[PDB]
Design an enzyme around this catalytic site. Sequence first.
Site, mmCIF file in Angstrom:
data_model
loop_
_atom_site.group_PDB
_atom_site.id
_atom_site.type_symbol
_atom_site.label_atom_id
_atom_site.label_comp_id
_atom_site.label_asym_id
_atom_site.label_seq_id
_atom_site.Cartn_x
_atom_site.Cartn_y
_atom_site.Cartn_z
ATOM 1 N N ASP A 1 10.946 -9.377 -6.528
ATOM 2 C CA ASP A 1 10.373 -8.105 -6.300
ATOM 3 C C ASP A 1 8.630 -8.528 -6.273
ATOM 4 O OD1 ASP A 1 12.373 -6.600 -7.876
ATOM 5 O OD2 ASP A 1 11.722 -8.265 -9.900
ATOM 6 N N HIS B 1 0.176 -9.092 10.396
ATOM 7 C CA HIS B 1 1.019 -9.766 9.817
ATOM 8 C C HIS B 1 2.456 -9.120 9.375
ATOM 9 C CE1 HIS B 1 -2.455 -9.534 6.949
ATOM 10 N NE2 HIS B 1 -1.524 -8.735 5.831
ATOM 11 N N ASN C 1 -14.101 -14.161 5.419
ATOM 12 C CA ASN C 1 -14.969 -12.880 4.147
ATOM 13 C C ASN C 1 -14.526 -11.889 4.282
ATOM 14 O OD1 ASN C 1 -16.917 -14.985 3.203
ATOM 15 N ND2 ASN C 1 -17.296 -15.267 5.594
ATOM 16 N N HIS D 1 -5.941 -10.205 -10.006
ATOM 17 C CA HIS D 1 -6.829 -9.128 -9.426
ATOM 18 C C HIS D 1 -5.473 -8.138 -8.526
ATOM 19 C CE1 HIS D 1 -9.825 -5.780 -7.727
ATOM 20 N NE2 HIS D 1 -8.722 -5.784 -7.065
ATOM 21 N N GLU D 2 -4.901 -8.114 -7.648
ATOM 22 C CA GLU D 2 -4.385 -7.940 -6.602
ATOM 23 C C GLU D 2 -3.072 -8.039 -8.048
ATOM 24 O OE1 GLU D 2 -4.510 -6.682 -3.921
ATOM 25 O OE2 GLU D 2 -6.314 -7.844 -3.781
ATOM 26 N N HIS E 1 -2.674 -4.111 -8.754
ATOM 27 C CA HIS E 1 -2.858 -3.283 -8.142
ATOM 28 C C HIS E 1 -0.876 -3.156 -7.867
ATOM 29 C CE1 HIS E 1 -6.426 -2.121 -6.506
ATOM 30 N NE2 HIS E 1 -6.347 -3.010 -5.675
ATOM 31 N N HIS F 1 -8.297 0.863 -8.720
ATOM 32 C CA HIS F 1 -10.238 -0.235 -9.099
ATOM 33 C C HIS F 1 -10.576 0.837 -10.226
ATOM 34 C CE1 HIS F 1 -10.136 -1.546 -4.885
ATOM 35 N NE2 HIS F 1 -10.611 -2.147 -5.456
HETATM 36 O O1 LIG Z 1 -9.030 -4.736 -3.683
HETATM 37 C C1 LIG Z 1 -8.724 -5.382 -3.198
HETATM 38 O O2 LIG Z 1 -7.440 -6.016 -3.375
HETATM 39 C C2 LIG Z 1 -8.977 -5.225 -1.085
HETATM 40 C C3 LIG Z 1 -8.125 -3.995 -0.415
HETATM 41 C C4 LIG Z 1 -9.063 -3.556 -0.973
HETATM 42 C C5 LIG Z 1 -8.854 -2.045 -0.558
HETATM 43 C C6 LIG Z 1 -9.263 -0.553 -0.702
HETATM 44 C C7 LIG Z 1 -9.789 -1.062 -0.677
HETATM 45 C C8 LIG Z 1 -11.345 -2.004 -0.871
HETATM 46 C C9 LIG Z 1 -10.598 -3.001 -0.778
HETATM 47 C C10 LIG Z 1 -11.092 -4.294 -1.390
HETATM 48 N N1 LIG Z 1 -10.260 -5.522 -1.605
HETATM 49 S S1 LIG Z 1 -11.054 -6.887 -1.195
HETATM 50 O O3 LIG Z 1 -9.785 -7.366 -1.004
HETATM 51 O O4 LIG Z 1 -12.230 -6.569 -0.864
HETATM 52 C C11 LIG Z 1 -11.022 -7.416 -3.125
HETATM 53 C C12 LIG Z 1 -10.169 -8.187 -3.451
HETATM 54 C C13 LIG Z 1 -10.641 -8.887 -4.585
HETATM 55 C C14 LIG Z 1 -11.097 -8.079 -5.828
HETATM 56 C C15 LIG Z 1 -11.190 -8.988 -7.077
HETATM 57 C C16 LIG Z 1 -12.313 -8.247 -7.888
HETATM 58 C C17 LIG Z 1 -12.890 -8.893 -9.115
HETATM 59 C C18 LIG Z 1 -12.914 -10.120 -9.451
HETATM 60 C C19 LIG Z 1 -11.934 -11.151 -9.007
HETATM 61 C C20 LIG Z 1 -11.538 -9.928 -7.275
HETATM 62 C C21 LIG Z 1 -11.947 -7.024 -5.471
HETATM 63 C C22 LIG Z 1 -12.006 -6.417 -3.797
HETATM 64 CA CA LIG Z 2 -11.380 -12.192 5.231
HETATM 65 CA CA LIG Z 3 8.443 -5.900 -3.393
HETATM 66 ZN ZN LIG Z 4 -0.733 -7.211 4.805
HETATM 67 ZN ZN LIG Z 5 -8.449 -4.221 -4.913
#
Ligand SMILES: O=C(O)[C@H]1Cc2ccccc2CN1S(=O)(=O)c1ccc(-c2ccccc2)cc1
Ligand SMILES: [Ca+2]
Ligand SMILES: [Ca+2]
Ligand SMILES: [Zn+2]
Ligand SMILES: [Zn+2]
Length: 165
Positions: A59, A69, A79, A119-120, A123, A129
């Site tokens: 899933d 990609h 970064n 965090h991912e 989502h 957020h």
């Molecule tokens: O938000 C996302 O997934 C991606 C994609 C996206 C899409 C739309 C708007 C903003 C963002 C920002 N990013 S990101 O890579 O900069 C990010 C990743 C992890 C965390 C985090 C927060 C708290 C604890 C640990 C990790 C924060 C930001």
């Molecule tokens: Ca990057």
């Molecule tokens: Ca899937």
């Molecule tokens: Zn992707």
């Molecule tokens: Zn996020």
Amino acid sequence: FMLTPGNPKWERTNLTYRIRNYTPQLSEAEVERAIKDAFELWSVASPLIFTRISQGEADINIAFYQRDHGDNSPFDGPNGILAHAFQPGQGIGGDAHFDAEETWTNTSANYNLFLVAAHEFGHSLGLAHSSDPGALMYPNYAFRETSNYSLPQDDIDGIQAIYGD
Ligand SMILES: O=C(O)[C@H]1Cc2ccccc2CN1S(=O)(=O)c1ccc(-c2ccccc2)cc1
Ligand SMILES: [Ca+2]
Ligand SMILES: [Ca+2]
Ligand SMILES: [Zn+2]
Ligand SMILES: [Zn+2]
């Protein structure tokens, strides 16, 4: 907390996931453990159960990719954007991609894979957020002790709002 627009959510509680590739920065076991523990954070605050499969269709696909990609959301090198995931749904739905150009760690140094994966997955499960600066779903990354980490209360509220009562 904020639920993703449309309120997309998994209609099954047992979900499978598959780690498609790895990162040279850590061992395979370290990547597998970071992912496992990240899923476990959400699992202990909801009725969701995650099962890893080694090959096949899962899933939630998990992978490390560089720049373009195949999904029209290219990564950007070291970064900046660290990773991204798709809302619950078929196919690409729920999948989590990590920028292969980052320094991935299991330490306090940028960037802790366990924390970013956690965090991912929020989502992947349907959360957007949070405006709570202490929430795991807050828009900006920040290190927090990981040894005995547990979901901040706001994230618990969020996942309970989706998969709870
Ligand atoms: O938000 C996302 O997934 C991606 C994609 C996206 C899409 C739309 C708007 C903003 C963002 C920002 N990013 S990101 O890579 O900069 C990010 C990743 C992890 C965390 C985090 C927060 C708290 C604890 C640990 C990790 C924060 C930001
Ligand atoms: Ca990057
Ligand atoms: Ca899937
Ligand atoms: Zn992707
Ligand atoms: Zn996020």
